[PDB]
Amino acid sequence: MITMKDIIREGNPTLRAVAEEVPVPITEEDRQLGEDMLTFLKNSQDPVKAEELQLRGDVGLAAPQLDISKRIIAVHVPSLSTVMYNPKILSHSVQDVCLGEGEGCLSVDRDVPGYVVRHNKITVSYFDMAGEKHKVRLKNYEAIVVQHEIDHINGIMFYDHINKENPFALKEGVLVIEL
Template identity: 55%
Template structure:
């Protein structure tokens, strides 16, 4: 089981590396890692389990965050209608996106960042993501709102990019033109 002691923090070199593709069909070892990533985000959202194991709540986790530089991520998040997006994917990739931008009014956080980093993080309002599930089956997701932002945040981890790399350094709360503000 992944706990906070397994999650590396900003400054660790793995977080700035581009992660390697996972061979499909995946190995049992890669499947186990993917399963553990999803297990963490689900466990961290359960108040009893999170308290028992000292887990910081998270809605997404990427393999580089546990010092495994491979293209794997897990997301467990609900959209504004309450629909659950619970996915663990190998080699996820954004294959199309909207011109329109979106951002979280509260800003973004990260399990690998132990401090608050205020500011708006511009993201695409809608994305289509393609990846492979734990059994090596292709998955294609059309996402908008919070799920779209979470997938972009986690895919950034696979490319060595941290969320705060997108924040305007001179004016962190500068309005993003024609962007949808998403409350969380």
Template identity: 55%
Template sequence: MILMEHIVREGHPVLRTRAEELIFPLSEVDRELSEDLMGYVINSQDAELSEKFGLRPGIGLAAPQLGKSKRIFALHITDVDQEATSFIAINPKIASHSIEKTYLSSGEGCLSVDRDVEGYVPRYARITIKAFDLQGNEFKKRLKGIAAIAFQHELDHLNGIMFFDHIDKEVPFKDIPGATPFERD
């Protein structure tokens, strides 16, 4: 079981490195890593487990956050329409995106960042993604709202980018042209 002590924090070089693509069939190590990533996000959202093990709640976790430079992440969230979005993405890509932007009005956070970083993080409002599942089958999904924001946040981790890199350093709450703020429940 992944605990907070296993998650690397900002300043660790792996968080600034472009992660390596995986080759199929997956090794047992990569399969276990994928399942561990999903296990953490599910467990961290369970109030009892979160308190018992001191887990910070998260909706996504990428392999680089565990010190592994591999293109894998897991998402487990409930979006605006109360539909569960839960999947492991291997070698993920954004196939297309909207012109319209969005951002979390409360700002983004990250399990690898132990401080509050204020400011708007511009993201595409809607995206179509492609990725592979554990068996090597390619899948395609259309995401919007918090699911689209979370996917982009985790994809950034695979590219060595931190969420605060997108925040305007001079004016953190600067208006983002063409963007609609997303209010998270």
């Protein structure tokens, strides 16, 4: 099972590489990895299991974070729970949004304050565990989580988006989500 020890941290070059497209039909190994990734997210959000396994609560995970450079992401948002293979953002809203509390990441062992501005609405296409295609419209927190994970497969970390000069600057028109 996936543990914190399996999650690589900032400094490991794999986090900055562009993940490889995975085969379709989905291989049994990529299917198994996805299952284990979703299990990890669920375990991290169960108060008892999180304590037993000493896990940080997490709503999204990307294969690169396990040192597996593949375009596979898992999300479990407290409304959306699935594994996406070869996910792509087909379109997005003009309107942007950011989490009021900023963002974190299990691969980052320091607090990096500041707003991470992302698109409030996105249309994403992906293949599920069976290799069947899906086209979904996401918004708000779900959209934020998916963009955070897709960034991982493109070698991007959340703090790359923070305006170091003015970490809490809020443009015109940007929404704020307060969890």
